[PDB]
Amino acid sequence: KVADPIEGVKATASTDKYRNYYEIFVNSFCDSNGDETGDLQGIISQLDYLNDGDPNSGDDLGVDAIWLTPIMPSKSYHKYDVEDYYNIDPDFGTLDDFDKLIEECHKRGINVILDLVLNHASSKNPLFTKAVEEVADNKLDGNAEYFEIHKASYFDSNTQTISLGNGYACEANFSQEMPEWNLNSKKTREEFTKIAKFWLDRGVDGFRLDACKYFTNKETDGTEFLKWFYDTCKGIKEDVYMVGENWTDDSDIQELYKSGIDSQFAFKFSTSTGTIISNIISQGGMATAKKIMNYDNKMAESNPNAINAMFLSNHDQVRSGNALESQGLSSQKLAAAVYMLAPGNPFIYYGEEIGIKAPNTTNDAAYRTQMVFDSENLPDIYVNGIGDEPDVPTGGGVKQQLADKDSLLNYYRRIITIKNQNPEIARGRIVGTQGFDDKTVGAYYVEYEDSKLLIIHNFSKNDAKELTITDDMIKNATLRADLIPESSSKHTELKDGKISVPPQSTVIIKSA
Ligand SMILES: *[C@@H]1[C@@H](O)[C@H](CO)[C@@H](O[C@H]2O[C@H](CO[C@H]3O[C@H](CO)[C@@H](O)[C@H](O)[C@H]3O)[C@@H](OCCCCCCCCN)[C@H](O)[C@H]2O)[C@H](O)[C@H]1O
């Protein structure tokens, strides 16, 4: 019977770089034409589920940016081997379907970034097939100049290669079908400028940049390359946004931020062995708050405009729900609150919001299962390596979960609404932790210019925490928002300076 503190509070749609992102593995999301392959028209058909354009009404998820996995011609179902950087794979649609998707996203306040694969191309990209022919004729000063082609003996020993003619090879860390670009090449830079402009001119808001760890090599400074590319794209589109996958230690992420790239994925906090899920299982609130503050701030030293990119899991990892669901739905809910209420831009993986699991932990295809909009009418999508038979989410599909006020999905929805009511959360920096003499409680102050919030998480699985909020912490403290997983009907309150934070709950404190 305690009033919901967010009732009637005005939400505002984001109009800047700060977004709750949604990663769509295109193959697996929505099939509009019966071939068992997801496509762009399928995404279009579900845009009102993603964002209906009105932050103050409706039953949409509410995400305000999409990251599309590769959409360009490729023989593979994942398409990270790019055969043509200037078109749409026919299974996904045409450039007209792409233009429709952009228009329809933007009408709803949804930004769109593309997976732009700069480390490597397909071995069937025509630029590369020409290089291969020319190398076989001992011509190295044509198309070979686009690619990381050298005599075999040049390569660092632990570098995998593609064998070419006449004793030459091409760097290929990921596959024999993924030859690497020479990022130092004049010709390559020219080509990348053309590809960037091609997509930016179609209304794209920016890029996800895979495999940044492999920009740097024996002769390439990846920071120099990414700075060159990023600044090129800023000239084309001043408010272009990029997020890099740099799957490596913190010091390498610090280094790469000197490029001025907005964001790099925060791998440290992802997966079952990562900070967030590990500490939700271990009930380590205080540790998690400390680690988020220290990491966000360290990265800001390298780039003062860094936008951290928190995530539980992506298309290259086991689904987060494989670890979290067996710990109870309230653990899954807390996890969402923790990663999404950290500074920066969180990335929800499609289907995470309804608890899609991986049927096995070892096969990448099992990380990319079929999105379930309605568990009564299961999808019919083929995913190479796991077939087309759909798993049923424990909580049902989108339609089921939207109706149930206590669903995982509705918890995500509420998190997003709280963010749309409180811009400081995404845009600010953590200026300090707040101790509550309890290792289960993780609390920190996020401040964005003139405005500070106190975010408190109770990681305890079983125990409510009665906390005292003083004027030294937040002057004239009020309860701005709550997230209480046990029941959507349950709210708390701040009364005579005391607030009960239930198990696995989050509260947000703000000055009157
Ligand atoms: C970022 C990218 O950098 C990375 C590489 O492009 C993406 O990963 C994708 O590509 C790899 C490699 O796929 C290619 O090579 C494999 C291995 O030879 C071929 O099998 C594929 O057909 C070819 O496209 C891919 O890795 C799959 C490895 C499978 C191992 C199975 C072993 C057990 C067998 N019983 C990824 O699945 C694909 O996404 C990455 O996703 C980007 O984010």
Ligand SMILES: [Ca+2]
């Ligand atoms: Ca289709």
Ligand SMILES: [Ca+2]
């Ligand atoms: Ca809405």
Ligand SMILES: [Ca+2]
């Ligand atoms: Ca490389």
